[PDB]
Ligand SMILES: Nc1ncnc2c1ncn2[C@@H]1O[C@H](COP(=O)(O)OP(=O)(O)O)[C@@H](O)[C@H]1O
Ligand SMILES: Nc1ncnc2c1ncn2[C@@H]1O[C@H](COP(=O)(O)OP(=O)(O)O)[C@@H](O)[C@H]1O
Ligand SMILES: NCCC[C@H](N)C(=O)O
Ligand SMILES: NCCC[C@H](N)C(=O)O
Ligand SMILES: [Cl-]
Ligand SMILES: [Cl-]
């Protein structure tokens with residue numbers, strides 16, 4: 059069990075219902091790095107950039123390989139850092155390192171000196187049987203001996219999306235967090251990140267549509283970025299609805315969504331609309347034990363009515379990008395994929 | 401002093417701060433009727449339909465002569481009632497009768513058996529020197545004897561608008577009500593009501609513009625009619641701003657105004673907006689001691705910053721109509737006006 063606490067009051071509050079204390083790196087990009095070390099050298103197996111930010115369990119985040127936003131300069135650091143760790147820890151086989159990038163700054167989240175659940179995905183993306191190799195390394199056959207020394211960077215985009223069990227436990231708030239709840243994952247391959255994500259998204263059983271009306275109800279910290287997303291949704295032909303505070307901000311930017319009522323506000327309210335299959339998309343971000351408990355109805359309704367929803371703005375952006383792609387336009391075999399690698 | 405109470409709780413409330421009790425005729429048209437009685441006949445001097453509903457003092461209302469929305473059928477009833485009254489009360493010279501029309505039904509508000517302040521405006525509009533005629537009647541010369549026996553209905557519209565002293569007492573809520581606060585009045589002459597109104601309004605020192613951004617903030621009981629008004633302003637080329645509840649209503653009608661925060665809501669709020677010259681027009685209707693006192697800010701700011709504002713929906717419609725006219729287009733002299741009378 060892990061929880062994110064925002065203020066002093068919040069602290070106690072936890073403590074009640076309730077030890078390591080760690081500063082929470084807000085508005086940070088989470089990254090996964092799987093590599094192999096034989097004591098001589100380090101092979102970077104893969105650098106994966108999570109769509110959802112730090113604060114949403116890596117196991118429940120979608121991810122990209124290669125990274126789709128991160129600078130080469132920054133990857134390189136992470137790359138260097140790993141290597142440092144790999145030798146220091148005396149890693150012999152597979153390892154995994156999780157970072158957080160905030161303000162062009164690389165922070166260390168943790169190091170797992172073993173095979174991580176990311177391995178298979180990378181293996182598939184890169185064509186390198188990381189598990190086998192590392193195995194061979196563990197048994198005494200160096201990377202140099204294996205002829206696996208250079209890090210592979212694929213020509214295409216490899217996106218991993220997860221599947222959540224919420225529909226099996228309705229009394230639960232289908233909301234992301236620091237604790238992992240997913241049971242499985244899917245993989246999307248595309249020429250473009252937008253194409254890969256669209257494949258992964260569909261693959262994950264999403265009910266996202268390429269039209270209709272979107273509901274936007276984001277948290278403060280997001281109110282500022284929501285604008286561009288609304289704009290993207292608007293470019294696509296979506297009609298917008300928005301709750302008070304978010305409508306305010308949109309409006310202030312030249313965007314007038316249709317104002318909707320919260321549940322305790324009037325009628326109809328969001329639940330009603332959701333229920334009536336008024337939406338095709340819902341973006342809903344929240345921050346705070348209270349804010350969360352209070353928005354619980356949106357999410358529960360959304361899940362129940364099968365409306366694709368995102369609980370992260372990062373995730374909303376990706377959903378948006380993918381509207382530009384066509385998941386059924388082109389198919390490629392794993393064999394072909396791997397053949398494309400130089 | 402006079403006040404309008406809405407519910408039991410409201411009654412006590414008043415009582416505290418605080419007797420003739422009268423049912424208030426909501427959503428009713430107020431009408432003024434000036435006439436002369438010589439004991440033999442009754443001369444209808446004029447039938448003036450106010451713009452502002454009953455509840456807003458006749459002295460503080462703009463008015464039209466002739467009526468601009470009242471059926472001939474209904475007027476005729478009021479004309480017959482005035483007659484009945486004239487003879488019954490024994491009037492000899494001037495009289496004024498006040499009615500309220502609600503649901504096609506004529507209701508009597510009061511009878512002033514003397515010269516009313518509307519007498520000069522009616523004389524002007526009609527070319528008939530009512531005070532001079534009623535004076536002769538009082539002195540002994542009948543209507544028949546002076547050859548003033550038929551009611552005059554001018555070929556043009558005559559609108560009267562008032563001037564209020566709120567700008568002299570800033571600590572005062574510049575809102576209309578059952579008590580008269582106006583100091584003076586102006587007259588507008590036009591080929592149509594819209595033209596007469598425009599001239600009256602301009603005449604009144606209104607800072608109304610034909611473009612810009614309007615702010616709509618209406619009461620429940622008005623949220624239905626507001627839509628049409630919102631549309632009218634839209635047709636004109638105005639951009640709309642509105643508060644929550646209003647925005648909700650407009651939204652459901654397909655009109656998506658730019659959301660604006662009430663003062664307690666956040667930022668920016670109307671006060672800020674008004675202060676920063678964003679609006680060129682304001683429509684704010686309010687009902688209830690509490691509702692009123694809360695909305696006080698809008699009105700005060702509107703007056704301080706010199707934005708034209710209407711505190712009645714009926715007023716807003718009239719303002720709307722006059723946007724279609726040009727009060728500088730054509731001028732006419734009183735001698736000319738009177739010469740057009742047949
Ligand atoms: N300091 C932190 N700042 C932001 N997010 C963090 C922080 N520590 C952990 N997280 C988030 O919580 C997740 C779980 O943390 P982690 O220590 O790796 O847990 P686990 O033991 O389950 O592997 C991360 O994948 C990340 O999204
Ligand atoms: N029963 C009523 N229903 C609606 N409006 C009314 C009613 N009684 C009075 N009013 C409003 O109050 C104003 C003043 O009432 P009135 O009896 O004429 O007082 P005063 O002697 O000052 O003229 C009217 O011009 C009208 O706007
Ligand atoms: N990979 C996380 C699941 C995505 C889900 N639509 C959410 O945003 O909650
Ligand atoms: N006829 C009364 C003055 C009108 C003023 N603009 C108001 O609506 O309050
Ligand atoms: Cl359950
Ligand atoms: Cl004052």
Ligand SMILES: [K+]
Pocket residue numbers: 088108109110111112113114115116119
């Ligand atoms: K993450």
Ligand SMILES: [K+]
Pocket residue numbers: 168170
């Ligand atoms: K761990």
Ligand SMILES: [K+]
Pocket residue numbers: 430450451452453454455456457458461
């Ligand atoms: K009136």
Ligand SMILES: [K+]
Pocket residue numbers: 510512
């Ligand atoms: K009176």
Ligand SMILES: [Mn+2]
Pocket residue numbers: 116156168
């Ligand atoms: Mn972890």
Ligand SMILES: [Mn+2]
Pocket residue numbers: 458498510
């Ligand atoms: Mn009166």
